[PDB]
């Protein structure tokens, strides 16, 4: 039973504007999500400093990008701290985010959309290339949950009984817009990663599916 | 709630012997599973001849091999006909298989274990390299189920609420033995596939996870 929640008004505004913007450097969404993933891993790593057990649900700290061309889906996974149901609701929607309005104001002023991450709202940059997103998260402190949004004013959080078990972490499953399917390509993903994510403490793995010759 | 079933006695015997055999051409397990996958795809393709809708749950007919080194798991997936709960119980255990005893008798006589497929029991060749297997299957006619076996006399079939949704088909999730982790390697998998699966009507995709340079 998927629970539905309302996005804080400003977040909804931000999403509508992001998903509708003509911005030409949409690739920054990946830098933003890799950065977030990186942050999630930092959290779990730091947390595990005084609670090593926290790493055992998924010993490997990594960021994995998995293109699912057939579904026009791009997944960015991290074995970071993950988010509990409450955290998904809290962090990804209902709670007013510090910079949401500020960033939008910045944008109005001419700020580059790539500044989104500095306003703490980079997560939403995903709507630059996706019109729908499922944040599948497994926090050590909770079951696996699916937070899903289509940039609309409400999002759902559903106990995850349909996706692969995340030992711990988050999978941002991006349902790419039809004109952004370039991010399903290994070469493209590869170049975007090297361009904006040169300094990431965690291995960034790209899952490539190739037909055996 | 996982349901437990007893393997037909001979299948249990076959598994014990296979999982315990010293055979040196264990790679044939892949040829056997790819062949089975191929057969599953043949089924769905043929079935869809008079019921096209049957393909819509997963339009792409493919065999996908996904090494999961971190879990010492090798998955062989096909978007074939899949198996319903009843079929998993029926086909993979409780029902006496035509050649099980025959093959074992053949083996006793000196027959090469690679003959397993000609006795219709090639599926079990997986125990050559795995000590545990989960057959996650999604048939159009049923929910996604997990059939699991550790070569013991009983297997379980559990409604799948923990694995990725298979549009349609089967994932043979092999928990490789510690000395057969070579099948997690792309080069190895690649060579085994080309050696024994030269004539497969379906694309055989290898999912490789590579850390972005």
Please, what are the domains in chain A? 1-213 (3.30.565.10)
The secondary element (H helix, E strand) that includes residue A85 is helix A85-89
In the block, which residue shows the tokens 């014990």?
B16
Resolution (A): 1.8
Whether residue B137 contacts residue B77, with contact meaning beta carbons closer than 8 Å, is answered with no
Query: What residue of B is the nearest CA neighbor of A59?
Result: B70
DSSP, collapsed to helix, strand or coil, labels residue A149 as strand
Contact B205 A209 (CB under 8 A): yes
Query: What residue of B is the nearest CA neighbor of A202?
Result: B211
Interatomic CA distance for residues B189 and B186, integer angstroms? 5
Report, in angstroms and rounded to the nearest whole number, the Rg of chain B calculated over CA atoms.
16
Spell out a b/e string for B70-93, using b for 16 or more CB atoms within 10 Å of the CB, else e. eebbbbbbbbbbbbbbebbbebbb
| DSSP-derived secondary structure letter, A164 | P
Interatomic CA distance for residues B59 and B53, integer angstroms? 9
Interatomic CA distance for residues A61 and A63, integer angstroms? 7
The secondary element (H helix, E strand) that includes residue A156 is strand A154-159
Interatomic CA distance for residues B118 and B110, integer angstroms? 15
A53/chain B closest Cα distance in angstroms: 18
B64 contact residues in A (CB cutoff 8 A)? 209
A210/chain B closest Cα distance in angstroms: 5
- Elucidated via: X-ray
Contact A211 B203 (CB under 8 A): yes
Binding site members of A: 32, 36, 78, 83, 91, 97-99, 118-123, 170
Contact A204 B211 (CB under 8 A): yes
Interatomic CA distance for residues B36 and B39, integer angstroms? 5
Whether residue A65 contacts residue A193, with contact meaning beta carbons closer than 8 Å, is answered with yes
**In A, what residues contact B, Cβ < 8 A?**
60, 64-65, 70, 161-165, 189-190, 193-194, 203-213
Whether residue B151 contacts residue B142, with contact meaning beta carbons closer than 8 Å, is answered with no
């Amino acid at each position: 039973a998927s629970e539905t929640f309302e996005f804080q008004a400003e977040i909804t505004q931000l999403m509508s504007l992001i998903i509708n913007t003509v911005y030409s450097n949409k690739e920054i969404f990946l830098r933003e999500l890799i950065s977030n993933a990186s942050d999630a891993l930092d959290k779990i790593r730091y947390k595990s400093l005084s609670d090593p057990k926290q790493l055992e649900t998924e010993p490997d700290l990594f960021i994995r990008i998995t293109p699912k061309p057939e579904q026009k889906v791009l997944e960015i996974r991290d074995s970071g701290i993950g988010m509990t149901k409450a955290e998904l609701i809290n962090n990804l929607g209902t709670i007013a985010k510090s910079g949401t309005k500020a960033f939008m104001e910045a944008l109005s002023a001419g700020a580059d959309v790539s500044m989104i991450g500095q306003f703490g709202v980079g997560f939403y940059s995903l709507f630059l290339v996706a019109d729908r997103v499922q944040v599948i998260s497994k926090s050590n402190d909770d079951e696996q949950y699916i937070w899903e949004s289509n940039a609309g004013g409400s999002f759902t959080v559903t106990l995850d009984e349909v996706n692969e078990r995340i030992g711990r972490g988050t999978i941002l499953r991006l349902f790419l817009k039809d004109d952004q399917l370039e991010y399903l390509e290994e070469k493209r993903i590869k170049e975007v990663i090297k361009r904006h994510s040169e300094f990431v403490a965690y291995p960034i793995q790209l899952v490539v599916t190739k037909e055996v010759e």
